[model samples]
Target: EMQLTPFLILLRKTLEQLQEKDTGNIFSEPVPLSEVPDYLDHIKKPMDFFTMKQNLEAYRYLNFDDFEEDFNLIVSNCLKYNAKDTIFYRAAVRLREQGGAVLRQARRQAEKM
Candidate 1:
């Protein structure tokens, strides 16, 4: 019977494609399937969440003058990490949910200048 490949297996396959281009350091580092710990086998990790959060966090302070650029960075990083467009949208949803306070602060500060 045919079975669907596991997500990690697919992830490793996708990441392997980067190696073929020989773009040195195009990614943080090589992530072979073998390197994934066995303990993680059963857990369904959403690739987009961790990566998107990290990228978004990096842009946290740019909600004022660089709002567009900050959003572009999040989208770019999601695509770079092989995340789907839907996943990027989810990140934006989270930003709206969780970032209101800081974003308001940035806007308020901007108006004061």
Candidate 2:
């Protein structure tokens, strides 16, 4: 396992912050996601685990179609980052599983509207 989880969490927060009209201040800046990966790579640490179920659960509640692509980007990166970890892996499996749940929930929510 690696320290990738915190960075991924920060990435999610940063991306969400960027989508907001006002990011508040430097504390809300999105630089951490860009810079932290450098430190992770510079120090030769393996990528950490992401909160797949939690993120997908939240993502499923978003009603905007434009956000679907952004969510897809996160999922894409999550898989890519984990690819080198294992050809057959646990995190990726869980991520995909949760992604499907998010899809179903999103569809259900859409149908209700």
TM-score of each: 0.28, 0.37
**How many clashes in each candidate?**
0, 1
Cα deviation of 110, candidate 1, in Å = 2.1
lDDT of 1 by residue, 1-113 (tens): 22223322332332233223223322233223475445234423323223433544454422233443443343344344443556444554444333444445544544544
- CA lDDT of every candidate: 0.38, 0.41
Highest-scoring model, lDDT = 2
Residue pair clashes in candidate 1: none
TM-score of 1: 0.28
Q: Tens digits of per-residue lDDT for model 2 on 1-113? A: 22544434434543443334122222122225565555344323222223323443464324334344444544344454445566423444554555455555544544444
**Residue 92: error of model 1 in Å?**
4.2
